[PDB]
Design a protein around this ligand. Structure first.
Ligand SMILES: [K+]
Ligand SMILES: [K+]
Ligand SMILES: [K+]
Ligand SMILES: [K+]
Ligand SMILES: [K+]
Ligand SMILES: [K+]
Ligand SMILES: [K+]
Ligand SMILES: [K+]
Ligand SMILES: [K+]
Ligand SMILES: [K+]
Ligand SMILES: [K+]
Ligand SMILES: [K+]
Ligand SMILES: [K+]
Ligand SMILES: [K+]
Ligand SMILES: [Mg+2]
Ligand SMILES: [Mg+2]
Ligand SMILES: [Mg+2]
Ligand SMILES: [Mg+2]
Ligand SMILES: [Mg+2]
Ligand SMILES: [Mg+2]
Ligand SMILES: [Mg+2]
Ligand SMILES: [Mg+2]
Ligand SMILES: [Mg+2]
Ligand SMILES: [Mg+2]
Lengths: 109, 51, 112, 139
RNA sequence: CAGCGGUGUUGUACGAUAUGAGCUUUCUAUUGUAGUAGCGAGUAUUUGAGACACUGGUUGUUACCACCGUCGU
RNA sequence: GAGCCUCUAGUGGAUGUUUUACACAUGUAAGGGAAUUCGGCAAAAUGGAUGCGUAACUUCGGGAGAAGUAUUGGUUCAAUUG
RNA sequence: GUACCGAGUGAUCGGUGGUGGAGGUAGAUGCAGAGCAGAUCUUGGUGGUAGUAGCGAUAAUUUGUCUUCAGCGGCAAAGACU
RNA sequence: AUACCACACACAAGGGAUCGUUUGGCUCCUGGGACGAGGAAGGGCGCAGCAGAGAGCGAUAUGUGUGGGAGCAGCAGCAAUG
């Protein structure tokens, strides 16, 4: 995975990355742009991104015309099974009470 | 529909038995020169006029 | 036996719509092997096919509003759209009155 | 009208049988070279030395509260000139001594400043310094 | 991405607590005493609060040093 | 058995890109208010219920919802259809 | 039938080398359904325009997982609509 | 004109002209000129070991008698007891 097989835990500013996107389709295009954010943060454009169903379900919670302001996610990096020339990044939802104090952390296991 | 006369039913029964390709053994026979049965029809492309 | 067909036959057996049938995920082989209504009856008995519950539509607000209107709330001049006669029919008021009065006179005469 | 209202309706006569270069057509607008003649220097100064007028006895730099919107704070020397100037913030410009002297009375007059505005350019700016904001609010 | 400073926009968060035009008289222990309440729009305090953005200021953490082609010496 | 919202039962694909100008369906506008145009064409304004108050003319039936004006939410009470 | 080369003012005629696989002329006379660039000619076959114009009125779609072997196909979980 | 457009030649595509062939047509001549209540002409439906169309035949849907005589076109079976 990452250095010392750690997972990286980060927060995604969904409010900012979607500023220009139309109200009618906000949640549909937000998914395309969450994946793009990840690939630039780890400098790996050609890689795959995989979204766990719990994270999908959190994002769609107020229907198509909305998206949450911030979301906290744990990321793992693995070789892509269907073509191991690529990597795949796997995203898991982390439930938080408040965002105050949460930076970017690397956690063992 | 579900209501039919006897005369209409026999027309449908006959029109249904005739609608078949050339059987696969005939093609092997020395004297036989047909390719495809030109009398085959589709319900999407023709009317029977049974009415 | 395609899985869409399993749902149709199950819907027939459990007397509900196809939108309420749940197929269990962990033995698709066991489902796909089914051939007949009696196979499906066994799968239903074993709990691999399940009828889901109905979606909720509560009467909380309807009851609350009804009690308030019984106390005489709402029902002011800015809440009504029909004519006085549509809301409280005039022929009905007459018919209620005169039957009471006639009944009163009948009893008084008959009792002397 | 059908087929659109935001156009020139007639783009020529029958003869000559070509479109003339004098008729208006759609195309590029903006991003052209332009020279503005005879602009006057009101003030010259430095981004980190405070200044005052004979009348405004506050001492402050040229920088408004929170800086200029996509630039921040001036640090080096600066010039101040009358009116507006070509291009957005951050573009390079060339300055030249005037080609010929002006006879107009509006150009050749003296300038005496009494106040310079230093309030915020984001939103309605209502204070001239952080001291005033700290005094208006509590603590 | 977060602190901590700075500059704005909106208008005073959730939850508690107190009051409120009026309407009402319930319970426990036990013979007679003591205990002893409900229902209610709104308003005030905590609270220029809470939310949201930008920072060419400053601290922490995390990521990034490749590769392929063309013309020349 | 209007429009708007839900229960039962049923439902959906020519891919990606924030995407100028000119369009086609729509919103909003300082001061002025038909100056526009063959022509107020298009749009705006009025709108339900309750009360007060209602002209010429008329075949005496009508005109007539004439016109013109006021009221309307939530809560807690009285009184019983006002 | 196809490339070359020669003869004739010309309509046309002759030879050589490949392809083809069973029929064909030179002279004198006889009989005609006897020579094409055109008729908005008749029938059949093919271009440029052009990888262009267009293919998207209506409720709306996302994620995982298996097949499919590469079907927004099927199944689970959400989001919508009549 | 490095790559576009045009023309010439060789090879590969695309189409079916030409030449060679014909159990068909047309014309003239000669014969014939034979249907039905004893159900005609014309229409429908059935019949094969595997059988759609067409040909042949009627629930006896390849039967009887006479004259001949070697195979039944594919696959499986039949045939001098035809
Ligand atoms: K019918
Ligand atoms: K049909
Ligand atoms: K009446
Ligand atoms: K509060
Ligand atoms: K406050
Ligand atoms: K109904
Ligand atoms: K209704
Ligand atoms: K006018
Ligand atoms: K006029
Ligand atoms: K008009
Ligand atoms: K009269
Ligand atoms: K009138
Ligand atoms: K021709
Ligand atoms: K000619
Ligand atoms: Mg028009
Ligand atoms: Mg500004
Ligand atoms: Mg205006
Ligand atoms: Mg105005
Ligand atoms: Mg005019
Ligand atoms: Mg109009
Ligand atoms: Mg030969
Ligand atoms: Mg001719
Ligand atoms: Mg186009
Ligand atoms: Mg709708």
């Amino acid at each position: 995975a990452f250095k010392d097989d750690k997972a990286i835990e980060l927060t995604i500013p969904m409010g900012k990355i979607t500023i220009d996107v139309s109200k009618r389709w906000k949640c549909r295009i937000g998914i395309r742009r969450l994946k793009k954010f990840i690939t630039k943060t780890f400098h790996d454009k050609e890689a795959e991104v995989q979204i766990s169903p719990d994270l999908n379900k959190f994002l769609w919670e107020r229907g198509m015309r909305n998206v949450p302001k911030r979301v906290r996610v744990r990321v793992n990096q693995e070789p892509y099974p269907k073509d191991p020339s690529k990597k795949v990044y796997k995203l898991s939802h982390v439930v938080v009470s408040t965002f105050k104090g949460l930076g970017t952390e690397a956690i063992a296991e | 529909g579900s209501i039919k006369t006897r005369r209409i039913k026999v027309q449908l029964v006959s029109a249904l038995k005739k609608n078949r390709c050339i059987p696969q053994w005939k093609r092997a026979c020395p004297g036989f020169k047909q390719q495809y049965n030109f009398t085959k029809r589709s319900w999407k492309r023709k009317t029977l006029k049974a009415c | 036996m395609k899985l869409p067909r399993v749902k149709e036959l199950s819907a027939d057996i459990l007397k509900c719509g196809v939108r309420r049938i749940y197929l269990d995920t962990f033995e698709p082989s066991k489902l796909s092997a089914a051939t007949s209504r009696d196979d499906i009856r066994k799968l239903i008995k074993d709990g691999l096919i399940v009828r889901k519950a109905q979606k909720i539509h509560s009467r909380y607000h309807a009851n609350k509003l009804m009690r308030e209107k019984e106390k005489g709330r709402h029902s002011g001049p800015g809440k009504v759209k029909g004519s006085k006669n549509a809301r409280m029919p005039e022929k009905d008021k007459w018919i209620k009155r005169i039957r009471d009065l006639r009944n009163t006179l009948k009893e008084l005469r008959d009792k002397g | 009208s059908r087929k659109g209202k935001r156009k020139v309706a007639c783009i020529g006569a029958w003869h000559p049988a070509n479109v003339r270069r004098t008729v208006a057509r759609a195309g590029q607008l903006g991003f052209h070279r332009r020279t503005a003649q005879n602009k006057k220097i009101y003030m010259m100064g430095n981004g980190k030395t405070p200044f005052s007028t004979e009348y405004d006895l506050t001492s402050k730099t040229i920088n408004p509260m929170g800086g200029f919107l996509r630039y921040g704070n001036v640090k080096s020397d600066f010039i101040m000139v009358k009116g507006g100037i070509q291009g957005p913030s951050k573009r390079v410009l060339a300055l030249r001594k005037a080609f010929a002297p002006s006879n107009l009375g509006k150009d050749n007059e003296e300038i005496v400043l009494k106040f310079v505005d230093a309030s915020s350019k984001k939103g309605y700016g209502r204070f001239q310094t952080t001291e005033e904001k700290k005094a208006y609010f509590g603590i």
